[PDB]
């Protein structure tokens with residue numbers, strides 16, 4: 001049962017997928033292979049909710065029905081800074097220009 | 105005249121829909137549509153030699169089918185069951201479908217959304233979205249070759 | 262395994278290489294690509310398109326709608342044409 005995700009920190013967005021049954025920790029292992037930071041140097045979030053390593057993505061509320069390939073769910077990512085974690089910070093995408101009047 | 109140059113343009117548009125199922129049978133169309141929302145539709149080839157194409161659509165009572173004829177360069181709905189006097193004629197069969205879809209937004213024909221045989225190109229999905237916003241391709245801030253691309257498929261479905 | 266696609270405003274999208282090969286233009290290019298004319302509100306949607314295209318080609322699943330807001334559609338059309346996808 002596949003969930004399709006955007007893992008986001010600052011100006012970095014990882015597109016990946018996983019199962020409802022896989023764990024938060026297994027997501028951190030995916031992030032580790034891409035960004036080369038170990039799981040214990042990562043915090044993962046759904047909105048402002050810090051995710052426990054032991055929980056399944058389904059247990060955190062990521063569902064196949066709402067994390068689709070055409071509309072992936074966002075997981076926030078914060079990294080270790082020195083002796084603590086940086087605050088979660090996801091930088092927005094650019095904003096679209098104004099619609100031409102005839103398509104309004 | 106059958107106007108084969110017009111027919112080929114119409115069949116090219118049909119190839120672009122992503123909801124043309126080709127040699128699909130009536131039974132296969134029934135199975136694909138048996139559980140779809142009311143108004144879900146596709147187009148496929150007709151088993152009947154007097155007809156070019158068939159619309160298969162989910163009604164409240166189950167999938168049903170409606171043939172399209174192509175005569176003298178014009179597509180129209182089956183004139184054996186429709187009053188040929190009240191039948192609009194189209195140069196384009198995708199136009200025919202789009203017209204009835206939009207008229208439904210405003211056995212009876214009720215069409216909503218197509219059942220796709222394959223995921224369209226991102227360019228085509230953009231084209232559809234733009235066509236749902238406007239028909240005024242001529243004035244969009246696009247390079248000419250993209251305007252020509254939009255012109256090849258002007259429909260909202 | 263993964264490639265990095267960078268928008269004009271400096272967002273980095275890390276996507277499966279196999280999914281990025283949906284674009285003939287990326288595929289002919291090929292681990293990092295810079296798109297000087299595609300901003301992040303376009304390129305993020307391109308990346309979702311890649312996931313959707315791979316999932317719903319040659320599948321038995323009913324193909325769902327791919328959402329495109331009208332405000333990105335013109336730029337998205339230009340990007341998809343440049344990307345050949």
Ligand SMILES: C=CCc1cc(CNC(=O)[C@H](Cc2ccc(OP(=O)(O)O)cc2)NC(=O)Cc2ccc(F)cc2)ccc1F
Pocket residue numbers: 129130131134149150151152155157158167168169170171181185186211212213214
């Ligand atoms: C303005 C128009 C009004 C309109 C009128 C009608 C009348 N429709 C028929 O009476 C068709 C006749 C037909 C049957 C097969 C067919 O397929 P093909 O062309 O391949 O032979 C084409 C037409 N009856 C069926 O569908 C019954 C059926 C269903 C499922 C199945 F599994 C096998 C048969 C339908 C909608 C409308 F809005």
